[PDB]
Design a protein around this ligand. Structure first.
Ligand SMILES: [Cl-]
Ligand SMILES: [Cl-]
Ligand SMILES: [Cl-]
Ligand SMILES: [Cl-]
Ligand SMILES: [Cl-]
Ligand SMILES: [Cl-]
Ligand SMILES: [Cl-]
Ligand SMILES: [Cl-]
Lengths: 44, 40
C-alpha cells in the first residue's frame, strides 16, 4: 500500500542522493588535486 | 517498519545535507580554479 510505496520511494531517493554525493565527492577531490598542483606551480 | 521509515528519512536527510555541502565546495573550487587559470 501507501507505506511500502513510500518506503520504496524513500529508498530510491536515497540511492540517487548517494550516487550524486559520490560523484560530487569525486569532483571535489579532482578540483582539489588541480588547485594543489597549480599552487605548487606558483610556489615554483 | 515505522522505524525503517524514520531511519530511511534520517539517512536521506544526512545525504541531502552532505550533497549540499559538497556542491558548495565544488562551486568554491570551480571559482578558484577559474581565477588561478585566468591568472596563469
Ligand atoms: Cl518522497
Ligand atoms: Cl539507482
Ligand atoms: Cl552532480
Ligand atoms: Cl579523483
Ligand atoms: Cl605552497
Ligand atoms: Cl509497523
Ligand atoms: Cl565551502
Ligand atoms: Cl573549471
Amino acid at each position: 500500500g501507501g507505506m511500502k510505496n513510500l518506503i520504496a520511494e524513500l529508498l530510491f531517493k536515497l540511492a540517487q542522493k548517494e550516487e550524486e554525493s559520490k560523484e560530487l565527492s569525486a569532483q571535489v577531490e579532482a578540483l582539489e588535486i588541480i588547485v594543489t598542483a597549480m599552487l605548487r606551480n606558483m610556489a615554483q
